[PDB]
Amino acid sequence: DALASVDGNNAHVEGSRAEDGEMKPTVIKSNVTQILRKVVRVSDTANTTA
Amino acid sequence: TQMVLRAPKRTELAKDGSYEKWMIEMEVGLRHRNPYASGVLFTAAGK
Amino acid sequence: TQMVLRAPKRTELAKDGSYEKWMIEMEVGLRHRNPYASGVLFTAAGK
Numbered sequence: 001d002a003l004a005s006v007d008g009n010n011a012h013v014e015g016s017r018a019e020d021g022e023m024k025p026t027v028i029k030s031n032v033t034q035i036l037r038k039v040v041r042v043s044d045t046a047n048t049t050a
Numbered sequence: 051t052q053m054v055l056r057a058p059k060r061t062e063l064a065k066d067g068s069y070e071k072w073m074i075e076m077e078v079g080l081r082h083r084n085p086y087a088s089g090v091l092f093t094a095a096g097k
Numbered sequence: 098t099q100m101v102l103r104a105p106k107r108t109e110l111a112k113d114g115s116y117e118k119w120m121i122e123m124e125v126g127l128r129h130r131n132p133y134a135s136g137v138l139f140t141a142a143g144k
């Protein structure tokens with residue numbers, strides 16, 4: 001979210017209405033994941049020796 | 051000595067497929083002490 | 098009656114990658130004594 005271009009002129013009289021003010025909603029930003037894998041093989045016959 | 055390296059073991063089976071096939075693996079070797087201790091005797095026909 | 102040979106069983110087969118395959122099997126057969134005992138009435142259309 002952000003602000004609506006703030007200004008330095010906020011000087012109101014002593015007692016008045018609201019003028020409905022002003023607001024700004026949020027913004028959504030999405031991302032997708034990624035899948036990366038590594039594979040390997042080994043023969044179990046390499047254990048008898050040292 | 052009946053040298054043994056890997057005892058019979060199985061891999062990761064049961065991927066809910068065409069499994070239920072088993073196997074028996076064995077890694078074995080032979081060794082002799084002091085070759086000039088035992089003896090072999092062949093069969094002879096002529097000369 | 099109902100003859101059963103292999104009860105419903107859950108099993109996982111040989112996994113490959115990230116499949117994680119599963120399946121259920123059931124071996125069943127149906128019986129009927131005195132074939133001429135029970136009865137069947139099919140339908141038909143009039144006009």
